[PDB]
hypoxanthine guanine xanthine phosphoribosyltransferase
Amino acid sequence: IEDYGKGKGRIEPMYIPDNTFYNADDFLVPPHCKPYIDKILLPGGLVKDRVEKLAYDIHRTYFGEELHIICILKGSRGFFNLLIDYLATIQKYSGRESSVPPFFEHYVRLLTVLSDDLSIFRDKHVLIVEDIVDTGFTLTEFGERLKAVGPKSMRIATLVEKRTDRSNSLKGDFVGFSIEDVWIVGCCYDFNEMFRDFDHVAVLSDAARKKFEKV
Amino acid sequence: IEDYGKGKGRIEPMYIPDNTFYNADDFLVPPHCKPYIDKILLPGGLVKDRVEKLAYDIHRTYFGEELHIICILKGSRGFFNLLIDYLATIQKYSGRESSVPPFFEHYVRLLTVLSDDLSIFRDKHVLIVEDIVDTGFTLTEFGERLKAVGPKSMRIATLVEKRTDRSNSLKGDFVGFSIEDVWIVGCCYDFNEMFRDFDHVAVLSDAARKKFEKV
Amino acid sequence: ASKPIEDYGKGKGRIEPMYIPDNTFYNADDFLVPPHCKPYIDKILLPGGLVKDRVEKLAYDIHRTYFGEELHIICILKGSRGFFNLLIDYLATIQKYSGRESSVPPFFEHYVRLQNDNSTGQLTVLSDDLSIFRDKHVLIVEDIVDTGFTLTEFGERLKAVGPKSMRIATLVEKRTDRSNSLKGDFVGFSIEDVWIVGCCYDFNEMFRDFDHVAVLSDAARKKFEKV
Amino acid sequence: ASKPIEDYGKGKGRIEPMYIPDNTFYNADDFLVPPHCKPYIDKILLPGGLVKDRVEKLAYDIHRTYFGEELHIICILKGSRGFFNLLIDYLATIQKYSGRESSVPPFFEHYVRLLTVLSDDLSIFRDKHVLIVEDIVDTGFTLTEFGERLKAVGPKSMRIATLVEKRTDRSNSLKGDFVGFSIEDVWIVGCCYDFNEMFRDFDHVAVLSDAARKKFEKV
Ligand SMILES: [Mg+2]
Ligand SMILES: [Mg+2]
Ligand SMILES: [Mg+2]
Ligand SMILES: [Mg+2]
């Protein structure tokens, strides 16, 4: 447990090079975000393929063992959801017997994290999932409380990871992608509560930003 | 608006005749649910079929106006999740333009509802979502809390509604199926956080029952 | 001489399919039906999601029986399309998640082709050099077996090449008058003798793209027969 | 007869495909590769996902330009299966959710075998809107020869859809009307592209490696 937020021996996320993108012209963008998204960074399909592997990583990892996954509610809604879909199916086609469910959901809200009694995790596998840890002070503060109950393990799954130079530098043990620190909307990422329903993790327009700033 | 929980406009739910099931055995049931299930009320594929249908109906009812769907947390993941998927997709292939997102998502846990600072829905169109609605000591209570902010619309969308001998029991506006008063697990349907990940909705067993505690 | 391929279209040792009781039907108004079919579809036999859930299981069975060895599946063109498609998708996916070792792919696809009011039931299955099925496990996928003529005929034709085992998978079997008929090895539903359409079932090239297996209505028969 | 029928193979007034710069690949590693393909796939060109996403946009495109008018889609055997099938799936759906009624199915499928195309009577097509489907137009023969045949029956139009399009030197060829990607001249396999009937079932479009090549025929 001392290793947390460090990614001790993770498999490195897929590297997405600086200034690399796709034209939205090339996809079916829904009319409403239509005029706001100029560049796609992660296509919805790429995300799903990558996430499929992630699940597999995780499945082979806690196989034959109770896994307690936690959704930091709001933003983790897409990934976590993809994730649970894949584990479920994976274990179903597995053919390796296991008399336990692929995982156990749990929900929490936020900035500090807000949860019920954590006594439930004493001596258990704890997988906390997020869309991204842009700070991890909140992850560190919650991780603290998590420690006290003596859970069996505690890891972090994160969709994205920004190579920045401004933070508290916490890292997941299961990362989908490693990206240019740029602004991203879509795929549950949002501006001002906007773009969550777009399928592609897009780069935020100077235009999206205006309209979605004020008038 | 005075019609909440009343089911006034409502198109009638897919009606499932009494004592009608399918054997689990001719389905692919993940090893950790094998000893447990025997009869299947609803194949997840039948339920994705119905829900696609409700999505449409809903899409048809709020086209071009903002929609705020509140997900009563924990028990409504399945349904809620399957719903925005469609909602959004339908919006995309409609080619009939709208400057508005398919929906705005919101989460409320908690047998009272553990709120949020719901003033925001001051004239919005709100659809509350539930997996099933057996009673009303909450659905009716939160409905009143809402009512006070003069939201522009109030409707409930429920996956299931058991045919019952009760009264003043809420009715949905967008209802999935009408099933008899039976004990069902799976497809998010619970039993001590049990059978959630199972695809379909199963009638449970004394068996499934027995095993599930500390005895 | 090649070894003789034992039972074939017997149905020897198979697992019986989902049994669908007579007069069991869902109502079209309860699902989303597209406009081109709307006016003609009232009763639904098998809701397309139901048949996915069902073929998921068939594929599981198919996997367990040929896993680890080459499996060559033949798609009888036009009809067997949807069913076949659903099947290789599951097939390869299961293969992919099994985390259970194999140096051979899920399958190798193959395609072939082929009475009514005045003619003859001599739909003769046509294909290339069959010689490629020698010592191979072959699986013939049909959307339904209705005369067994064409499959008995092809059957003979394939037995001459000495394939290693030769089975048949069909989406539905109709409960109807007969004996002296081919029975599939892997089959999804047992249904009563009613005229179906949709989900790749057709009425004079119609309905294939409808997503559920429905019953043919008098209006469909009318609107779409020979004028 | 506006927006002709003599432009076939020209790809005139098309919408240029998605452009995939040279030397752009993903690591196989970052994907879940099936055991049987594991040692042969080192690099990925087009992740099966990116493919569905492109095809979704092709499906819409094809929809808009044929709405309410019968479309006949000819799939070219073995090779164009995956792509063909992603197409008609999206087509069916997009029409199901359109709210713009057509009184006609979203398509009529037909299949052809193979290099000459192996058709049956093409009479079925007189007056028809015909869309032809390929994983790729390798060279011009097959199509041109076939287009000649088709044109003999006078379709209402004949267009080509192709998934991939290669940047090549030999250009005196067919250009597609609806094409997925523009790629580098590299040897690919997966997502219905095979190497001697190998890797059709793989999910992604991979580059043909030497091991797999060295291993799948001439030893
Ligand atoms: Mg977060
Ligand atoms: Mg609930
Ligand atoms: Mg047939
Ligand atoms: Mg081809």
Notes: Chain D has one domain: 1-219.
